[PDB]
């Protein structure tokens, strides 16, 4: 009890939509608390990647961080299904997965076993593919050195389109594209702009392969140290900032194509059914690994 300063880490850098929302959240919090709740920000992955920061929340060394609902598959394997390529069709579908009994089951397991209290989840965009050569069809993916994050389902998307996946951390991506150490990367409409991957990538392939949410997670042990009113402020505010964040991404995702082409970017609309070819065996193994079918259930929500 007293003045409280919460520690928030993120991989996103200053000038990102994720950071602007966290700064707005920082902006909202000590305003509504009359200075008693403060939020310190640690962007650009200076504390580690999202997996490392989640581990710090579990151990009580960091208070708040971003994570996708499917990224919980690192801890709760069935949760990765929401991130399987093309299974989640849009954000509204993902939120329905996030709020179903299956979602609440994962969220409960996050809280009991890993000290993660998900306060809300926001839209962070649908991932598209950029490259140094044009990607008109899935057949053009063969032999492409495609950068992916250290995430199984981003790799799977790359593997099954026929590309050569190269997993590496988000901070190294721009330069590896500049040096053509990798031929391409895959990320959302706002991230390619904010991170300025388009400066070093002449092609963009509307592949729509993964829909990213963005959970705001607080350490449960820190949450339980708060007063009921402080919790209400934080709850009110995160939900406050999420509506803006989700809307901001939707606005940007609608306009940024007009922007990229005006920056001489070649944008291709490949036929996606052959990409949907390919995840079919991946879905079947996923259900099999887990001991219980889930992929078909999730896709139908």
């Amino acid at each position, epitope marked *: 009890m007293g003045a409280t300063t919460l520690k928030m880490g993120m991989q996103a850098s200053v000038g990102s939509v994720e950071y602007n929302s966290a700064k707005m959240l920082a902006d909202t919090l000590e305003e509504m608390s009359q200075g008693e709740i403060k939020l310190a920000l640690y962007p650009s992955a200076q504390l580690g990647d999202d997996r490392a920061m*989640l581990q710090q929340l*579990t151990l009580g060394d960091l208070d708040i961080t971003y994570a996708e609902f499917g990224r919980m598959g*690192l801890a709760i394997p069935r949760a990765e299904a929401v991130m399987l390529p093309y299974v989640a069709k849009d954000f509204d579908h993902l939120r329905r997965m996030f709020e179903s009994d299956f979602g609440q089951g994962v969220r409960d397991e996050m809280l009991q*076993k*890993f000290n993660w209290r998900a306060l809300d989840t926001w839209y962070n965009g649908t991932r598209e593919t950029t490259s140094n050569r044009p990607l008109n069809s899935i057949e053009d993916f063969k032999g492409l050195k495609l950068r992916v994050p250290n995430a199984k389902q981003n790799l799977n998307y790359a593997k099954l389109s026929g590309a050569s996946p190269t997993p590496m951390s988000f901070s190294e991506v721009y330069l590896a594209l500049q040096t053509n150490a990798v031929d391409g990367q895959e990320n959302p409409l706002p991230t390619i702009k904010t991170m300025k991957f388009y400066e070093v990538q002449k092609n963009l392939a509307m592949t729509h392969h993964i829909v990213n949410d963005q959970m705001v997670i607080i350490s449960e042990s820190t949450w339980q140290k708060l007063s009921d009113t402080d919790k209400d402020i934080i709850q009110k505010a995160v939900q406050k900032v999420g509506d803006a964040h989700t809307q901001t991404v939707k606005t940007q995702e609608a306009e940024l194509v007009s922007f990229f082409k005006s920056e001489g970017i070649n944008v291709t609309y490949p036929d996606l059914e052959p990409f949907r070819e390919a995840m079919q065996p991946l879905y079947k193994e996923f259900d099999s690994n887990i001991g219980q079918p889930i992929v078909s259930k999730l896709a139908a929500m």
Partner: nanobody
Amino acid sequence: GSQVQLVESGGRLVQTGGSLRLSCAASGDTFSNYVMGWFRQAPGKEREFVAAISWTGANSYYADSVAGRFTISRDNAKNTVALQMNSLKPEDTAIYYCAADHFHVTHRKYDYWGQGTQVTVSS
């Protein structure tokens, strides 16, 4: 197949000041998905955390009782975790347990556990 099976080896009678390497073999689910930990138990007590190592080996955690003396390491090709014990003292006599979990945790016990391996340190 989601569960992990663990088998420790290395337990011996050793001398004060001696060094001993424990090894643990993991099977079942994908080894690199798990933080690997070492715990030890004397009768009556609960278990002491000894050491833990992250998925890639980049992060490792140690108890103050063994920090500087013990070293934990893993091999994701052999699916093994090892605990190198140096400067062993009698307080360290215990059954040492290999454990696996998706994340390092302190508010609860790890999900998966080995049969236990006995370490005896003589004065």
